């Protein structure tokens, strides 16, 4: 399948310690990524994708939008 561009967050976890998360980016849905996403950035430097199916999601709809 001729690979078009993809979402940065194709898969996610609900499982993360909030103590670790220094920051939080949210980006809308777009033509280059159908689902919206949010990128939690940790203390050590990594970034992670967190689930919008979980009730980490009601702090999105309101948040950016």
């Amino acid at each position, epitope marked *: *399948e001729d690979g078009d561009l993809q979402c940065l967050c194709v898969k996610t976890t609900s499982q993360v310690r909030p103590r670790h998360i220094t920051s939080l980016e949210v980006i*809308k*849905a*777009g*033509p280059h990524c*159908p*689902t919206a996403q949010l990128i939690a950035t940790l203390k050590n430097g990594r970034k992670i994708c967190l689930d919008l199916q979980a009730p980490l*999601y009601k702090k999105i*709809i309101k948040k950016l939008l």
Partner: antibody
Framework: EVKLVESGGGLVKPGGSLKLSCAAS????????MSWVRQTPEKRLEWVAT????????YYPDSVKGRFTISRDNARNTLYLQMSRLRSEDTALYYC????????????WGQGTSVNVSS | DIQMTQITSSLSASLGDRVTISCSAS??????LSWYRQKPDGTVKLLIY???SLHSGVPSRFSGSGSGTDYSLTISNLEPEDIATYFC?????????FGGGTKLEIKR
């Protein structure tokens, strides 16, 4: 209600011009991606245009590139579709729509302003 | 371009029935499908987004499903407000393409 009134639709002669308008009401218009879709007389639906709410880009399909020109005015809460060099095929009912937020489908559509196009 | 194929132009179903309305896709979309309903006259309104998540103000009898290239909308106990045409869109990639539409009519 989220509401989308549309206007400017009418009869135009082939190779002509027309500017459709779509008045928005019931949401933060500036922070929403907006689009235009049309319904052929044949009946089928057809994507026409989209515009990024971070002011940025416009996206059109091959069938109308360069002829059509989507544009917004966040001050007015109004979305324009600037049509020119019209054709037989462009005869259709033109809906303005709202993309956006979590999953990027068109969640709200207007009544629909009509564009009959003949000589 | 993704050819979105809604195989049954129209389909017959008596009132109070269970209706399945299939929409197949030329290539894999990532359950980024939609469903729309157009009242014979009225505007169209978003029914389901993603593949199965229902839009606000949509009855509970509407339930989407599917994965890959095949998808279905399905309406338990059909009500006369639902005699209409139904459309599937995909939004996985540009250009956004719709289905041919399925008209719903009542069997006699």
């Amino acid at each position: 209600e989220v509401k989308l009134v549309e206007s400017g639709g009418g009869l135009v002669k082939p190779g002509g011009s027309l500017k459709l308008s779509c008045a928005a009401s019931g949401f933060a218009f500036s922070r929403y991606d907006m689009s235009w879709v049309r319904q052929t007389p044949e009946k089928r639906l057809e994507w026409v245009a989209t515009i990024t709410s971070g002011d940025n880009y416009t996206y059109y399909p091959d069938s109308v590139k360069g002829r059509f020109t989507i544009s917004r005015d966040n001050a007015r809460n109004t979305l324009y579709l600037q049509m020119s060099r019209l054709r037989s095929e462009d005869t259709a009912l033109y809906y303005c729509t709202r993309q956006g937020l979590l999953y990027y489908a068109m969640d709200y559509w207007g009544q629909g302003t009509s564009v009959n196009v003949s000589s | 371009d993704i050819q979105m194929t809604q195989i049954t132009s129209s389909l017959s179903a008596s009132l109070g029935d269970r209706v399945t309305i299939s929409c197949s896709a030329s290539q894999g979309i990532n359950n980024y499908l939609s469903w729309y309903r157009q009242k014979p006259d009225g505007t169209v309104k978003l029914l389901i987004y993603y593949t199965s998540s229902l839009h606000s103000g949509v009855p509970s009898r509407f339930s989407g499903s599917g994965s890959g290239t095949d998808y279905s909308l399905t309406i338990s106990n059909l009500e006369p407000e639902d005699i209409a045409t139904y459309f599937c869109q995909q939004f996985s990639k540009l250009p956004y393409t719709f289905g041919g539409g399925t008209k719903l009519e009542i069997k006699r």
